[PDB]
Amino acid sequence: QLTPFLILLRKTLEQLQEKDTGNIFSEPVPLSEVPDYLDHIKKPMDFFTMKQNLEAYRYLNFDDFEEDFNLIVSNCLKYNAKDTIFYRAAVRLREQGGAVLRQARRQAEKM
Ligand SMILES: CC(C)Cc1ccc(S(=O)(=O)Nc2cc3c(cc2N2CCCC2)n(C)c(=O)c(=O)n3C)cc1
């Protein structure tokens, strides 16, 4: 159950959600509100879905965790026009969440 790596991934996920101060990536993009979303985005991602994958043991190395974080950003940049709050927020999350992942990957390395 509890492993140091899974505890580290929990801490890191918390740290990334902290940077999404608007909570706009906290849950899946509401498919009812944007029914064309799945025509552009093959694999939606969000922080709640990441928590679901984490607790279901779907991340066994830091790479796979980071790959899902990257989808939260790249999905948002891909779907939204550049001059939008969403697009700008994904850029901000890319920068701020990148710093989070850098220091968390160091801890995953020495494990
Ligand atoms: C001017 C606006 C910022 C005002 C605004 C517009 C639409 C909507 S919403 O009801 O459509 N909800 C929504 C659509 C998203 C989205 C995230 C959300 N939420 C879920 C709850 C947090 C915001 N994200 C992350 C995307 O990347 C994306 O492309 N979309 C379509 C919500 C707010």
UniProtKB/Swiss-Prot annotation:
Tissue: High levels in testis.
Location of the protein in the cell: Nucleus; Chromosome; Cytoplasm
Post-translational modifications reported in the UniProt record: Acetylated by KAT6A.
Domain Bromo: 1-104
Domain of life: Eukaryota
Function summary: Scaffold subunit of various histone acetyltransferase (HAT) complexes, such as the MOZ/MORF and HBO1 complexes, which have a histone H3 acetyltransferase activity. Plays a key role in HBO1 complex by directing KAT7/HBO1 specificity towards histone H3 'Lys-14' acetylation (H3K14ac). Some HAT complexes preferentially mediate histone H3 'Lys-23' (H3K23ac) acetylation. Positively regulates the transcription of RUNX1 and RUNX2.
Disease: Intellectual developmental disorder with dysmorphic facies and ptosis: An autosomal dominant neurodevelopmental disorder characterized by delayed psychomotor development, intellectual disability, delayed language, and facial dysmorphisms, most notably ptosis. Additional features may include poor growth, hypotonia, and seizures.
Subunit composition and interactions: Component of some HBO1 complex composed of KAT7/HBO1, MEAF6, ING5, and BRPF1. Component of the MOZ/MORF complex composed at least of ING5, KAT6A, KAT6B, MEAF6 and one of BRPF1, BRD1/BRPF2 and BRPF3. Interacts (via PHD-type zinc finger domains) with unmethylated histone H3 at 'Lys-4' (H3K4me0). Interacts with trimethylated 'Lys-36' of histone H3 (H3K36me3). Interacts with ING5; interaction directs BRPF1 to H4K4me3-enriched chromatin at the 5' of active genes. Interacts with KAT7.
Name of this chain's protein: Peregrin
Organism: Homo sapiens (Human)
Gene expressing this chain: BRPF1
